[PDB]
Amino acid sequence: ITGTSTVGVGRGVLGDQKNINTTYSTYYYLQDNTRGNGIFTYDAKYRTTLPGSLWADADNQFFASYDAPAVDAHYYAGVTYDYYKNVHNRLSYDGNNAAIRSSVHYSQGYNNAFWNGSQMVYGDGDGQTFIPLSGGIDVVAHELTHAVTDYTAGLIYQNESGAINEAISDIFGTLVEFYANKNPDWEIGEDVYTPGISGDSLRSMSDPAKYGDPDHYSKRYTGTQDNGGVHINSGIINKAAYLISQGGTHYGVSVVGIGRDKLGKIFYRALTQYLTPTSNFSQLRAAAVQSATDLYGSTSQEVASVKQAFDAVGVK
Numbered sequence: 001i002t003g004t005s006t007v008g009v010g011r012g013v014l015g016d017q018k019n020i021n022t023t024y025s026t027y028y029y030l031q032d033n034t035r036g037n038g039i040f041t042y043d044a045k046y047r048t049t050l051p052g053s054l055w056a057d058a059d060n061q062f063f064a065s066y067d068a069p070a071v072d073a074h075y076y077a078g079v080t081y082d083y084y085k086n087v088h089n090r091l092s093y094d095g096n097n098a099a100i101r102s103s104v105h106y107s108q109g110y111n112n113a114f115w116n117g118s119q120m121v122y123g124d125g126d127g128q129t130f131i132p133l134s135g136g137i138d139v140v141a142h143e144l145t146h147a148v149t150d151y152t153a154g155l156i157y158q159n160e161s162g163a164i165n166e167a168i169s170d171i172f173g174t175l176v177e178f179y180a181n182k183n184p185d186w187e188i189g190e191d192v193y194t195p196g197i198s199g200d201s202l203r204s205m206s207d208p209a210k211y212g213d214p215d216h217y218s219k220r221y222t223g224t225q226d227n228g229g230v231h232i233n234s235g236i237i238n239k240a241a242y243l244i245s246q247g248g249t250h251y252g253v254s255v256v257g258i259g260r261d262k263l264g265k266i267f268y269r270a271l272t273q274y275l276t277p278t279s280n281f282s283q284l285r286a287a288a289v290q291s292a293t294d295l296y297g298s299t300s301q302e303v304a305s306v307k308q309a310f311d312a313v314g315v316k
Ligand SMILES: O[C@@H]1[C@@H](O)[C@H](O)OC[C@H]1O
Pocket: 087, 174, 175, 176, 178, 179, 260, 261, 264
C-alpha cells in the first residue's frame, strides 16, 4: 500500500520485544519499505487461502498473542534480507530485490512452515510439537534459503541432491541465527520445537547422531522415505560444515576450524557458482574445494580444512 514509513513495536512468539518497520495509511500495516521491494506480512486467519490480508493494526503496537507470529515472520524476514545483503551482497532471495511475503496463522494446529515458490507460509503449531514456527529465526532463514537455492543451483529435492538442499538451508539458517545473535547454536528449530521440553531440537549440526541422524557417508539412509532421506542425510553435510567452521576430530580425522564467516563464503560461492540440480555429495566437496581455492588459494588452510572436513564424514 501507499503510505508513510513508520516504526512500530511488539512482542514475538517467545515474548521478546522488538521494533518492526510498518506503513501507515489509516491503519499501520506490516509493510517494511526499507528493504528492497518490501517485506509484507499477511494474516491467513486460520485458513489455507494465500496470502490472506495484509496485516493491519490500529495503533502500531503488536503485543497481542495473535500478533506474535506476525511480528516474528516480519522481523526475521528482515534479518534474513539483511544477512544476504550485508554478508553476501545478495539482494533478497532472487538477487533482484523480490518482495518477501509471509503469511501467518496458516490453517489450524499446523506443525510446519514452508517456502511455496512465491512466499513464506507459517503454521501456528499444535502447541505441543511446535509453537508458531516463525518464532524460530533458523526456521525462517532455512526456508527462505530454499528460495535462494531455487534461484541459483536448482538442487533437486530427493536423494543426495535433496540432502544437500536441506543442509544448505540448515547452514544458512544457522549462519543467520548467528548473524542476528538470536541465541545462536548449531541446532535447528530449538526455539519453537516442543515447548514442554528444554534442550532439544529437530536436529543437530554439531552432533547429528544425538537424534539418530548420520554423521558419516557410511551411515547414510538408502531407503525411499523422506524423498530418499533428505532431512536425515543432511546430517552428513551439516557435520562437515560444522567441522569446517568450528574444527574438531571426527572419526579420527582432525579438522582445523576456520570460522563461520569463511564457512558461509565457501558454501555461498559453491551454491551460486558451481552446484547444479543433480550435484551429489562428492560434487559438493569438489565445489567447496574449488570455492575455497578461488577465495583463499590452493595452498591455503581454508582449502585444507574443507578437504579434512569432507574426509571426516567419508565424502571423497
Ligand atoms: O557469525 C557469522 C559472522 O562471523 C560472519 O561475519 O557473518 C555470518 C555470521 O554467521
